[PDB]
Design a protein around this motif. Structure first.
Motif, PDB file in Angstrom:
ATOM      1  N   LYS A  21      68.640 -46.613  44.690  1.00 20.68           N
ATOM      2  CA  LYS A  21      67.195 -46.534  44.590  1.00 20.68           C
ATOM      3  C   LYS A  21      66.894 -45.343  43.673  1.00 20.68           C
TER       4      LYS A  21
ATOM      5  N   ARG B 189      63.606 -52.402  48.411  1.00 18.93           N
ATOM      6  CA  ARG B 189      64.057 -51.103  48.896  1.00 18.93           C
ATOM      7  C   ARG B 189      65.039 -50.428  47.922  1.00 18.93           C
TER       8      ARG B 189
ATOM      9  N   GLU C  96      66.594 -56.681  54.624  1.00 21.73           N
ATOM     10  CA  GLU C  96      65.983 -56.254  53.369  1.00 21.73           C
ATOM     11  C   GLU C  96      66.219 -57.329  52.324  1.00 21.73           C
TER      12      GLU C  96
END
Lengths: 148, 146
Positions: free
Chosen positions: B70, B99, A135
């Motif tokens: 998040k 993300r 990521e």
């Protein structure tokens, strides 16, 4: 692995805010002698407690941007190899092993230019093989940044 | 944009921030007076925010933890950042795109019980997040600031 003299810790705390303080200024602040401060700092460096004297810049003003790369490895052997593979790259600022969703955490210093940044990220990623998950987090803002 | 000398100066100081102006002038082939002036400008413009050190966290009895957050909605990120940026053991806070939109680094004692106490106190201040991941750092293989 932990316990360290009380004065040594204060010294570390102080140097982290102003690493350019002369031994004399440090001695004055800590009510001791310059000679003793010299010996203390020297021991700290010898023992690897203080690894580097550096600066905290505003990377945006320098024309850079940060990117955090979160890596999940398939096996330990792959993790260590990835780490040795990227630890020598100049634009790779930090590499850490962790316990959690991602076992490898990497910080990259990239050019603020989106096209140059993306090209650089692709180059870096090519060096990451055998990963289950990768990521990339582009850092749009650095709000707080200290070492200790 | 910073000029050729300033750029090289930042680099040098990033390697050894305790260099004397004399040593800096020598490297950069200039005068201590000019070095003093450039560094003064760099500090005033906020290009150099601090002269610090990189210590061995493990040797001081601490361990890092990276928290990945998040938010459910974008505007929540600013709220969380405002709420956690003042906590003493929060070492860095960054807004991100991907993300996770918030990445936080915590400095914690190595004792897992004491570390858990600090982590729980910190997580308490993160309201209504979509995802929160806590990663304890077992080892720092490289740590530099540019």
């Amino acid at each position: 692995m932990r316990k360290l003299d009380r004065v040594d810790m204060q010294l570390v705390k102080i140097l982290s805010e102003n690493s350019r303080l002369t031994y004399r200024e440090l001695a004055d602040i800590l009510n001791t002698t310059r000679q003793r401060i010299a010996r203390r700092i020297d021991k700290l460096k010898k023992l690897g407690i203080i690894r580097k004297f550096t600066i905290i810049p505003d990377i945006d003003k320098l024309g850079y941007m940060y990117a955090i790369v979160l890596i999940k490895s398939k096996v330990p052997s792959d993790a260590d190899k990835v780490i040795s593979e990227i630890s020598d790259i100049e634009y790779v600022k930090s590499v850490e092993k962790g316990v959690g969703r991602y076992n490898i955490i990497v910080r990259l210093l990239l050019p603020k230019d989106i096209k140059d940044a993306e090209n650089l990220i692709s180059e870096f990623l090519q060096r990451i093989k055998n990963a289950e998950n990768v990521e990339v987090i582009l850092i749009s803002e650095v709000r707080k940044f200290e070492i200790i």
